[PDB]
Design a protein around this ligand. Structure first.
Ligand SMILES: Nc1ncnc2c1ncn2[C@@H]1O[C@H](COP(=O)(O)OP(=O)(O)OP(O)(O)=S)[C@@H](O)[C@H]1O
Ligand SMILES: Nc1ncnc2c1ncn2[C@@H]1O[C@H](COP(=O)(O)OP(=O)(O)OP(O)(O)=S)[C@@H](O)[C@H]1O
Ligand SMILES: Nc1ncnc2c1ncn2[C@@H]1O[C@H](COP(=O)(O)OP(=O)(O)OP(O)(O)=S)[C@@H](O)[C@H]1O
Ligand SMILES: Nc1ncnc2c1ncn2[C@@H]1O[C@H](COP(=O)(O)OP(=O)(O)O)[C@@H](O)[C@H]1O
Ligand SMILES: [Mg+2]
Ligand SMILES: [Mg+2]
Ligand SMILES: [Mg+2]
Lengths: 330, 343, 354, 258, 318
DNA sequence: CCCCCCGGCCCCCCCGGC
């Protein structure tokens, strides 16, 4: 902890103010309007991993209280003990007692509340209601099915969407400016494509790419660097493999698949995912083709998830695609 | 009574070749440059991120992490800077909440002057959760905020064989490193070096055959090479190891038996196939090897049409999936052969 | 006294009589045992895997491996339950069967094996090289029955403590063994003895035991009915000699195990009658078989291979039977209550046959 | 063993100081500088703040070359501090960028040495300077009387309400089995000034507090004979115990009135 | 700003029985009891946010008046309610001597009684019987089946049903008139539609929309309350072509951030209650959804698995 | 020096969808 430059990029670039959170304009604007007018309700932030829920709530707490927010808010998470006993004593006294420093209201942040037991959630029901005059509750979640209906009924819900392309591009530009790095346009497109709307993945991949360059100052990150560091198939490889499977014979298709996979040690699962993505845009005459493709490829992916023989799995992928595409003729 | 303690070098000189030739530094890793270069750059960048190593067995994940720790901290400071937990240790939610968290919260051990002068000594410790895929989902979730809150003084390394077993939040929090399979095109140099240092004499292509039989596992190849060397030394004939001996030691079915099985399948008679398979299972051949050899023979044969290959690929996939669940080999092999015979 | 199957067991590598190539390979392994890797012996049941493992241990350490003692070890679970494990130990090696504790077998790997591996060899066990031995052998019998958690726990123990312990795991099939464990072991195939070798062994036993054989054809018949199982062959030879006044004639009938007779009766019942009442009756037979320590997998295998031997069934029926057998074998491997899967298999076979 | 070296002639003093507030907090950051040791710690519920100060005059010898911060778990520190005896000198020793703190228990007469090492923890917390406040009421009373009153009223309820008005201080509790009210008045005894009840009231005060926190705060009565209580309507209640050189302060947030 | 506006759910919480909407017969019976007295042991059950706790508190107040402080013992899930508490605190309260108006009795309120352990419920049995002459018990719960039969035998049953859209509209309009909220008819219709019979949710959504956008119309209302995902899942499962179902899955659920586990659980729940489809077809769909859920729980939560599940469901109906 | 009180490990039994 000598300096912030020793931290991983995922933690070094954590937003500190609500203005540094990108891709959630609606939620940020609404929460800022609520806070400015002094009408903050009980909040629920539901979203997928790496969307900016924890960062957003921390920034909101820092804005409401300031630099010493950590001593004014009760933050609990899965790493801590959050049983019914903790709800009955710690949270209850925190909600029923005044602030030590200032004379404002009190904030309780239950991050990863989906990991809380049902008994604790039930106990929190009356805690939220009785002390609503001076206490506010924030619940952060990735899975809504783990939250009891009673708890959901007491909170106003905000959905964090997958990060749009523009926000990721702006954050990448900021990171490049800070790190004195050069990124190619195709490299940026590939980086955004493989992120799936997760900023942590983008930051980790960019940090890995910087370490790959021999001279990070005078060198630029190209699509080749991104593909090599992550060990992911290139679009050309996927196109060639699919074309060989769809138009060539069994021997040629098998040879092409093995040659493409051995040149860079590609993983079969990545090729399957890329081919599925490519085929999702195909206009097929018969629904049987789509049904067979989806079912057989899902079965192959499930089998791969448990190991098995790689060569047999690749042959199964080839055969499944070939048989499924035979329904497009009659 | 008591025995005088052995030296480290002497002890290592009598260990199995897999342990004897384990990589000692990051430069000894053979075919993981895409990640080894990134890990090596951190010795000067001093910003090591949270790592998630995943890949097939025998690719060099544990060796890579051990070498990285040794290079970062050195022989003396490594012990106080590393906390290793594997499948042989209790790793429940309680352990994560108390032991792992307490270690993460602890201040980094004070480096000595010698360590600071000879090693980078990064200002953080490392927690290595080997075989992390065996941990429950709740325990994994308990690590999410511990990873981020105390990242200033602690870094996490999760090593697994099945990446899907790691909950999405942990995978997102970790920078992912995929270890590629070690084949005859990227691992021949290491096996050749090991053979040369062991004075193992083999014919041309023997090492390539060993690596092809290993199917991505360098540990298996090294063990097979050691077995072949032991056999050759016991014979004491001074001749070179041959590919047939390697195949016999690896359990590969002779090609003649494979041709007999293929002919029986071609005949199509159920009773003859059943009798031949009953006789075949008496030799102890592993079903997985037989299925792999049948796949190699059929898929790469030009004397079969497209529909036959399409059906046989799915049949082989189903048989392999069923065998992967720990099923009776006799019944599965008989079913596969009968189904192929009726194609 | 001691059964002939046990009285004439070889106690050395030079006393072996079948699969000479395997004997040569084992002798090559024993020439320089200091760097011996972990071993996994796989092959058909009743072929002599344990005998060859004991012979290898005797060659490495000496006859003292055959001086065996039995002790009891206590274990405590997370629920405070107390479990007892019977440990067979010798001055040079330790034999364990963790599957005796079922789902708790992991603890045996976590505590007992860890404790043994974290202890170096200090006793002066002088070897043939003139220097004392440095590792103790551990034999994990029925390794195929270990749960995946125990196998995962075994992974790092074999690597970190390879200098103090060397593991020898004996199994009948490698399918249940996870790939990481198979990667850490040297795999040794143990083919079943040929009929001629079985006949030679049986003739030697007959000569030593003063048994009057009308002809040598009886030994061939016994060997052929054993399907390569030498233990079964020897025990059947003993059984056939105690029912004919220690004199075997060419008309002496082959004695089958009682459970085999019950399974054949069940097969005939299934073939003759295909009805719900027949299934209800067969459920009683299945429960009766399962209540007398007859494994479900063995029952399924024997039923499948007895149904396939019926001469009145056509090819389609046999194909359906084998497919259903494969499916329900997978179900048994992935299930807990075996009677459910067995009843389902019998119902499907009845439906297909009718 | 150069950077920080502080000697307590009697090891009972530091053990008593730790005993006073070990049940209120677990993780504490002790900052040692040329002028002594200062620490603050907020409890898990963020209801109570403990501030300890020990000056250089409470040490037989004290040398702190540069400011240092030591994060410690009070449970382990208390466990270590119950090893030494009351007749041994206690030396706290720390080095540059320390990772552990050394406790030396010395018995010169028996020439006996005991060394313990406690691993430090990386605690991220800032020294929250407590701005001086003009309190509405300020009183001082013997520690034993306050401890007895708190213990007595804690049985009858989980909350204790304190009223300060003209020349009277009232402690009230109301629960299920009954209620209780203790009334005390200012008084001074020239013969025994240690039992005097002193009060200075600017505005009347009425504040309710949790009994569990008061029961933990009264545990500091073993460090001083008198306790000072400063109360205000718009500030946390301050309970101060004065040591020979430093002090121990408890800032307790009153319960919301509703 | 360090100030908080009081939520309308608390600012406008009914204080008398006449201000509660829905369950007219039950509320009338409660008023009749409050008038005559002799309150019996009762258990009030219903779905969340319909006015059970409010009704209990209003009845207790209307019955006890100025004695509410001493004559009411209220316990909920946030308070300790073990066997020891029942045997010591509740017993002491029941045995306490309190002079009340001629036809009044002490009240013990046990909110969320469904979370109590069986031991405490068993212990309460004789306490209720031996002190019924001075004390009466009112339980409030969501799942009445979790109350042991011996306790149900000693208490009257009051089951509360969903509030009709008319009652929700009435209360929302009253609050709007008492708050000078500018609204449009479509906005109130959307609020009622998303509320799904929950008054608390409706009021919270109205307050959030007013504080965030000001004008309560359909557009602003839908910017605060998102479209219920169960209805989107039902549309996905009822689609004719596989392409339409896959489009619904990709555009409305997957790209919006909904997790695969949530999607599969909602699909199972919706399929279980799809009366339009025959029971056997629903059973096959449930088997397929269960297979997909088991695959997801093992770690493979990919979009391909959901697409395969949809393809199998469509194949079942073909 | 010895008795009473009352908080703190250990232990054992019962749920687990909605
Ligand atoms: N909207 C965003 N804008 C900028 N950076 C972001 C954003 N969302 C995530 N990040 C980056 O990702 C890191 C982690 O963000 P978090 O908000 O903690 O993840 P998350 O949304 O909480 O995911 P879960 O639900 O905890 S798994 C931050 O420190 C940023 O570097
Ligand atoms: N990349 C490599 N370079 C050199 N030797 C290797 C490499 N990978 C494996 N080996 C050899 O195989 C032995 C075992 O390697 P490990 O790294 O322990 O296996 P692994 O990658 O951990 O497989 P799993 O996941 O633990 S089953 C090493 O001691 C080496 O002798
Ligand atoms: N029938 C109703 N008439 C008027 N307002 C109501 C009604 N039901 C609920 N509300 C409002 O919603 C708030 C919460 O209702 P409650 O009755 O306290 O919750 P609930 O019905 O007990 O739900 P559960 O089961 O306890 S989670 C009340 O304070 C009112 O503002
Ligand atoms: N080489 C041999 N010569 C004579 N008898 C043998 C030989 N190998 C095995 N047997 C006999 O076969 C029987 C079964 O062998 P066993 O050790 O059970 O094999 P496995 O371990 O494969 O089951 C033993 O009782 C033994 O007497
Ligand atoms: Mg988060
Ligand atoms: Mg490893
Ligand atoms: Mg309530």
């Amino acid at each position: 902890k000598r300096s912030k430059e020793n931290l991983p990029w995922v933690e070094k670039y954590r937003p500190e103010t609500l203005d540094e959170v990108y891709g959630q304009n609606e939620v940020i604007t609404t929460v800022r309007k609520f806070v400015d007018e002094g009408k903050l309700p009980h909040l629920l932030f539901y979203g997928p991993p790496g969307t900016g829920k924890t960062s957003t709530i921390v920034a909101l707490a820092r804005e409401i209280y300031g630099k010493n927010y950590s001593n004014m808010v009760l933050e609990l998470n899965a790493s801590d003990d959050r049983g019914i006993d903790v709800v009955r004593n710690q949270i209850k006294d925190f909600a029923s007692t005044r602030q030590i420093f200032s004379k404002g209201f009190k904030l309780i942040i239950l991050d990863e509340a989906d990991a809380m037991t049902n008994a604790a959630q039930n106990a929190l029901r009356r805690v939220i209601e009785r002390y609503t005059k001076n206490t506010r509750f924030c619940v952060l979640a990735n899975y809504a099915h783990k939250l009891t209906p009673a708890l959901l009924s007491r909170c106003t819900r905000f959905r964090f969407q997958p990060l749009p392309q523009e926000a990721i591009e702006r954050r990448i530009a900021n990171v490049l400016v800070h790190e004195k790095l050069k990124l190619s346009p195709n490299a940026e497109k590939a980086l955004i494509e493989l992120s799936n709307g997760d900023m942590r993945r983008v930051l980790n991949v960019l940090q890995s790419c910087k370490a790959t360059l021999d001279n990070p100052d005078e060198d630029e990150i190209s699509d080749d660097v991104i593909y090599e560091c992550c060990g992911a198939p290139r679009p050309s490889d996927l196109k060639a493999v699919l074309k060989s499977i769809l138009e060539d014979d069994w021997g040629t298709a098998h040879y092409t698949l093995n040659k493409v996979r051995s040149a860079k040690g590609l993983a079969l699962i990545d090729l399957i995912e890329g081919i599925v993505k490519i085929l999702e845009d195909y206009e097929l005459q018969n629904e049987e083709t789509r049904v067979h493709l989806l079912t057989k490829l899902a079965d192959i992916e499930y089998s791969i998830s448990k190991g098995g023989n790689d060569q047999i799995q690749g042959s199964a992928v080839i055969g499944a695609i070939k048989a499924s595409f035979e329904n497009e003729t009659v | 009574r008591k025995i005088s303690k052995l030296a480290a070098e002497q002890s290592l000189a009598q260990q199995p070749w897999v342990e004897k030739y384990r990589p000692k530094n990051l430069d000894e890793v053979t075919a993981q440059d895409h990640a080894v270069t990134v890990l090596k750059k951190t010795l000067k960048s001093a910003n090591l991120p949270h790592m998630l190593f995943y890949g097939p067995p025998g690719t060099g994940k544990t060796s890579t992490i051990l070498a990285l720790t040794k290079e970062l901290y050195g022989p003396d400071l490594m012990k106080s800077r590393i906390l290793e937990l594997n499948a042989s240790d209790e790793r429940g939610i309680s352990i994560v909440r108390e032991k792992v968290k307490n270690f993460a919260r602890l201040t980094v051990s004070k480096p000595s002057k010698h360590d600071l002068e000879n090693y980078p000594c990064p200002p953080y410790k490392i927690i290595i959760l080997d075989e992390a895929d065996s941990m429950t989902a709740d325990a994994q979730s308990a690590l999410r905020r511990t990873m981020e809150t105390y990242s200033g003084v602690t870094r996490f390394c999760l090593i697994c064989n099945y990446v899907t077993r790691i909950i999405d939040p942990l995978a997102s929090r970790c920078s992912k490193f995929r270890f590629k399979a070690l084949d005859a095109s990227n691992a021949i140099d290491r096996l050749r070096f090991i053979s040369e240092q062991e004075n193992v004499k083999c014919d041309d292509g023997v090492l390539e055959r060993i690596l092809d039989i290993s199917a991505g596992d360098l540990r298996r190849g090294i063990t097979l090479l050691q077995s072949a060397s032991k056999g050759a030394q016991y014979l004491g004939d001074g001749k070179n190891i041959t590919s047939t001996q390697v195949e016999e030691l690896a359990g590969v079915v002779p090609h003649d038996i494979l041709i007999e099985i293929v002919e029986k399948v071609k005949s199509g008679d159920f009773d003859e196939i059943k009798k031949y398979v009953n006789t075949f299972m008496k030799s102890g051949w592993s079903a997985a090897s037989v299925v792999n050899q049948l796949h190699e023979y059929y898929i790469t044969n030009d004397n079969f049409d497209t529909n036959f290959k399409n059906q046989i690929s799915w049949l082989l996939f189903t048989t392999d999936s069923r065998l992967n669940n720990g099923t009776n080999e006799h019944i599965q092999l008989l079913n596969l052969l009968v189904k192929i015979s009726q194609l | 006294m001691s059964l002939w199957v046990d009285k004439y067991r070889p106690k050395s590598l030079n006393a072996l009589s079948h699969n000479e190539e395997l004997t040569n390979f084992l002798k090559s392994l024993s020439d320089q045992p200091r760097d011996l890797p972990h071993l996994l012996l796989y092959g058909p049941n009743g072929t002599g895997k344990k005998t060859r493992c004991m012979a290898l241990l005797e060659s490495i350490f000496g006859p003292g491996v055959y001086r065996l003692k039995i002790d009891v070890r206590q274990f405590v679970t997370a629920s405070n339950r107390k479990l007892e494990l019977n440990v067979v130990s010798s001055p040079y090696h330790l034999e364990i069967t963790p599957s005796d504790m079922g789902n708790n077998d992991r603890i045996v790997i976590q505590e007992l094996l860890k404790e043994v591996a974290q202890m170096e060899q200090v006793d002066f066990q002088d070897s043939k090289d003139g220097l004392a031995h440095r590792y103790k052998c551990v034999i994990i019998n029925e390794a195929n029955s270990l749960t995946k958690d125990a196998q995962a726990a075994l992974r790092r123990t074999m690597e970190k403590y390879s200098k103090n312990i060397r593991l020898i795991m004996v199994c009948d099939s490698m399918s249940p063994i996870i790939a990481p464990i198979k990667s850490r072991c040297l795999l040794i195939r143990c083919p079943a003895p040929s009929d001629s070798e079985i006949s030679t062994i049986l003739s030697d036993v007959v000569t030593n035991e003063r048994i009057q054989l009308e002809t040598k054809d009886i030994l061939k018949r016994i060997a052929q009915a054993s399907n390569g199982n030498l233990r079964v062959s020897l025990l059947m030879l003993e059984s056939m000699a105690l029912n004919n006044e220690l004199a075997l004639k060419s008309s002496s009938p082959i004695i089958k195990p009682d459970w085999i007779i019950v399974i054949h009766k069940l097969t005939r019942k299934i073939v003759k009658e295909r009805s719900v009442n027949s299934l209800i009756e067969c459920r009683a037979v299945l429960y009766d078989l399962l209540a007398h320590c007859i494994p479900a997998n063995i029952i399924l295998k024997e039923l499948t291979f007895s149904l396939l031997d019926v001469e009145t069934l056509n090819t389609t029926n046999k194909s359906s039977i084998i497919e259903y057998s494969s499916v329900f074998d997978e179900r048994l491997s992935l299930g807990n209550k075996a009677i459910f899967h067995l009843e389902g298999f019998i119902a499907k076979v009845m439906c297909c046959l009718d | 063993a150069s950077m920080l070296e502080a000697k307590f002639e009697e090891a009972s003093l530091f053990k008593r100081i730790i005993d006073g507030f070990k049940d209120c907090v677990q993780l504490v950051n002790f900052q040692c500088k040329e002028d002594g040791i200062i620490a603050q710690a907020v409890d898990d519920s963020r209801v109570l703040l403990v501030s300890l100060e020990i000056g250089v005059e409470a040490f037989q010898e004290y040398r702190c070359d540069h400011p240092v911060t030591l994060g410690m778990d009070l449970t382990s520190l208390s466990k270590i501090l119950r090893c030494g005896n009351n007749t041994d000198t206690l030396t706290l020793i720390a080095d540059n960028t320390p990772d552990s703190i050394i406790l030396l228990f010395e018995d010169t007469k028996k020439d006996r040495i005991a060394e313990y090492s406690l691993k430090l923890m990386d605690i991220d917390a800032d020294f929250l300077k407590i701005e001086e406040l003009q309190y509405d009421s300020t009183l001082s009373l013997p520690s034993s009387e306050f401890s007895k009153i708190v213990r007595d009223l804690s049985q009858l309820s989980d909350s204790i309400n304190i009223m300060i008005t003209k020349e009277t201080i009232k402690f009230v509790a109301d629960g299920d089995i009954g209620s209780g009210s203790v009334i005390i008045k200012p008084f001074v005894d020239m013969e025994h000034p240690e039992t005097s009840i002193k009060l200075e009231m600017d505005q009347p005060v009425d504040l309710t507090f949790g009994a569990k926190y008061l029961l933990d705060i009264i545990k500091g009565s073993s460090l001083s004979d008198r306790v000072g209580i400063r109360l205000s309507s718009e500030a946390p209640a301050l309970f101060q115990f004065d040591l020979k050189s430093g002090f121990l302060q408890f800032f307790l947030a009153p319960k919301f009135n509703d | 700003t360090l100030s908080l506006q009081l939520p309308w759910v608390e600012k406008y919480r009914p204080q008398v029985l006449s201000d509660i909407v829905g369950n007219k017969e039950t509320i009338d019976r409660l008023q009749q009891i409050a008038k005559d007295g002799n309150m019996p042991h009762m258990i009030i059950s219903g779905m969340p946010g319909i006015g059970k706790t409010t009704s209990v508190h209003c009845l207790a107040h209307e019955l006890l008046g100025r004695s509410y402080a001493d004559g009411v013992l209220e316990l909920n899930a946030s308070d300790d309610r073990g066997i020891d508490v029942v045997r010591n605190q509740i017993k002491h309260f029941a045995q306490k001597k309190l002079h009340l108006p001629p036809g009044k009795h002490k009240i013990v309120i046990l909110d969320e009684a469904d979370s109590m352990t069986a031991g405490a419920q068993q212990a309460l049995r004789r306490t209720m019987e031996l002190y019924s002459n001075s004390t009466r018990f009112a339980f409030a719960c969501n799942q009445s089946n979790k109350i042991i039969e011996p306790l149900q035998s000693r208490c009257a049953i009051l089951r509360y049903s969903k509030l009709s859209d008319e009652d929700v509209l009435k209360r929302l309009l009253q609050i709007i008139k008492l708050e000078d909220v500018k609204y449009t008819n479509d906005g109130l219709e959307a609020i009622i539609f998303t509320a799904e019979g929950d008054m608390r949710q409706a009021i919270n959504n109205l307050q959030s929309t007013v504080a965030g956008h000001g004008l309560v119309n359909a557009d602003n209302v839908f910017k605060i309350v998102d479209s219920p995902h169960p209805l989107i899942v039902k549309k996905m499962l009822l689609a004719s072509n596989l392409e339409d179902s896959i489009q619904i899955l990709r555009t409305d659920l997957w790209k919006k951030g909904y997790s695969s586990i949530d999607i599969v659980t909602t699909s199972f729940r919706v399929t279980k209650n799809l009366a339009q489809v025959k029971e056997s077809v629903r059973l096959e769909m449930i088997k397929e959804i269960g297979l997909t859920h088991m695959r997801i729980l093992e770690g493979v939560g990919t979009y391909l698995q959901l697409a395969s599940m949809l393809a199998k469901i469509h194949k079942l109906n073909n």
